[PDB]
Design goal:
567 residues; Polyketide synthase; monomer; binds adenosine monophosphate; GMP Synthetase, Chain A, domain 3; 5-stranded mixed beta sheet; alpha/beta; binds magnesium ion
Length: 567
């Protein structure tokens, strides 16, 4: 299996070797099973959709995938791989919402197709024609007769061929289309398997959205890569009842599952003690966390809350990656049992230095060891000189999982994918800040969101965490710290949602005062302004990540949903 050059050859092999083994079971409500596919049926379905795509002249073209989470999305995605159609997964449109994000992906990808379900096609086909013209074709894939797979013409696929476009979330700017090759997919799956060490006997569960790297490469393709069985549920099933994720782990004796940091906080806060009595989590051997800062207190709160259910903190598997690196770059605790943590000087961090406090301290969790044959360097982002040990700079990645570039952005591709430092060339510039310590990669934040105020660096996630706990009226996870120019000087602005229960009785002056006090004590900063906004209204990506740059744009133009302001 490690001799396959692409996922088409690999799925065809599993379809022969494990034809009747279930590959995916879908729990539509996160509880009761509602559909399933064997390896044999998955391959037959992919061939039938492939043949349907080729007859419709999609080969060599870009095609949006507009599906609910479920098995139809998976068939359409592999169907694109089988047919040679450049798939473009995206969040489906939702009722009473604008198609701005979808049109823009369509515009950027220069896509001539949208692949979807029969139900969705009937609601969006005429709107897509209004936006995209008559030469755009919206096709339904869920009613393709399986016999049509007999007409599939298997393309000559080499590793260097483009497999699909993975669009970034839009956190720091417009979503950019990452050109992911067939070889990227194979190489990274091997890297994931080096770190997780799953086998055919592994069992997984995932609630992650299938449209983006973690849920796609990890939740869909890695089970196929190792020959395992994967249980799936929609993200909305877990977010509305977090117990279902941990109950599924218990019921199927899942060995491998994971999620971003906030999901472990959600489980710790929303699962009752009696619900914990129903869990046996001693089988949960690898609990991965990535896609966001890994917080030491989150790990500890989760480990303590679920200790009586048999969760061991040594199962935590921190990891780091991005769409531009296909998925994973680093993961694991190295030789230690628990995730490595360091206690360093906060003021040092603000000055790009890693050192003990000799001042206040911050605790940072490492995001793993670099996996496999890839190379990671920490580089000064202006001088392009390699940092020495103890110095924070930009994370640069060189390896076979580094994507081919950004779709139709030749200037930006050259800037970010052709990084030169010292006598080195060909590095990917991640746009993340961090450092190396003890073989672990630590990530401190995003370069594009970094705040430089009064001659000092400040990480906005640090300020946002200080603000959200300053008063009961502020909703956790729904704030942004940005800087704005005031007479040529950068100054801090806070955009923060208030809770629904406090929106009608909000004492703006008292809560603003609490926020100013928290920021002064922890960060020695004075906000230029505090903007209180309605619950649910902060600029976010489809996955729910805050768009800090759009918070700044809305503050400066007066388009936020304001309930109160301090200035
Ligand atoms: N372990 C981690 N620690 C901190 N930030 C992370 C981590 N993993 C991923 N991220 C963030 O998520 C970004 C990639 O997002 P995406 O391309 O959507 O996977 C990275 O560039 C980081 O900014
Ligand atoms: Mg990014």
């Amino acid at each position: 299996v490690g001799q396959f050059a692409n996922f088409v050859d690999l799925l065809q092999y599993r379809a022969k070797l494990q034809a009747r083994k279930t590959v995916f079971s879908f729990l539509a409500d996160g509880e009761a099973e509602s559909a399933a596919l064997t390896y044999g049926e998955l391959d037959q379905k992919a061939q039938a959709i492939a043949a349907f795509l080729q007859a419709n002249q999609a080969q060599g073209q870009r095609a949006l995938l507009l599906y609910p989470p479920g098995l139809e999305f998976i068939g359409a995605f592999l169907g694109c791989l089988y047919a040679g159609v450049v798939a473009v997964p995206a969040y489906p449109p939702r009722p009473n919402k604008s198609f701005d994000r979808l049109h823009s992906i369509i515009q950027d990808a220069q896509a001539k197709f949208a692949l979807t379900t029969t139900e969705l096609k009937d609601k969006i086909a005429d709107r897509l024609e209004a936006l995209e013209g008559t030469d755009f074709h919206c096709l339904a894939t869920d009613q393709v007769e399986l016999i049509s797979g007999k007409n599939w013409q298997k393309p000559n696929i080499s590793g260097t061929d483009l497999a699909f476009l993975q669009y970034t979330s839009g956190s720091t700017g417009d979503p950019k289309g990452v050109m992911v090759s067939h070889h990227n997919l194979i190489h990274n799956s091997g890297l994931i398997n080096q770190g997780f060490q799953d086998t055919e006997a592994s069992m997984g569960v995932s609630w992650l959205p299938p449209y983006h790297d973690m849920g796609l490469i990890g939740g869909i393709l890695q089970p196929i890569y190792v020959g395992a069985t994967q249980i799936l549920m929609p993200p909305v099933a877990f977010l509305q009842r977090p117990f279902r994720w941990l109950k599924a782990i218990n019921d199927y004796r899942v060995s491998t599952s994971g999620a971003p940091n906030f999901a472990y906080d959600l489980c710790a806060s929303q699962i009752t003690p009696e619900q914990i009595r129903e869990l046996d989590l001693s089988c949960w051997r690898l609990a991965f966390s990535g896609a966001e800062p890994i917080r030491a207190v989150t790990l500890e709160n989760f480990a303590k809350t679920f200790a009586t259910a048999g969760f061991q903190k040594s199962a935590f598997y921190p990891c780091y990656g991005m769409a531009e690196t296909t998925l994973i770059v680093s993961g694991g605790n190295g030789r230690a049992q628990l995730p490595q943590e360091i206690i360093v000087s906060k003021q040092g961090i603000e000055a790009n230095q890693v050192r003990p406090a000799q001042e206040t301290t911050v605790t940072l969790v490492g995001s793993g060891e670099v996996i496999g044959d890839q190379i990671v360097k920490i580089v000064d982002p202006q001088a392009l000189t390699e940092c020495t040990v103890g110095e924070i700079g930009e994370v640069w990645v060189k390896g076979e999982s580094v994507a081919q570039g950004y779709w139709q952005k030749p200037d930006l591709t050259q800037q970010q994918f052709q990084g030169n430092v010292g006598a080195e060339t060909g590095f990917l510039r991640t746009g993340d800040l961090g450092f190396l310590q003890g073989g672990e990669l630590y990530i401190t934040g995003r370069l594009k969101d970094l705040l430089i105020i009064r001659g000092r660096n400040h990480y906005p996630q640090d300020i946002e965490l200080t603000v959200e706990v300053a008063h009961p009226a502020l909703r956790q996870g729904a704030g942004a710290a940005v800087s704005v120019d005031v007479n040529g000087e950068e100054q801090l602005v806070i955009v923060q949602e208030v809770e629904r229960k406090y929106a009608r009785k909000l004492n703006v002056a008292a809560v603003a005062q609490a926020i100013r006090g928290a920021i002064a004590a922890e960060h020695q900063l004075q906000p230029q302004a505090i903007c209180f906004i309605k619950p649910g209204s902060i600029p976010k990506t489809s996955s729910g990540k805050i768009r800090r740059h759009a918070c700044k744009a809305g503050f400066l133009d007066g388009s936020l949903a304001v309930v109160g302001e301090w200035q």
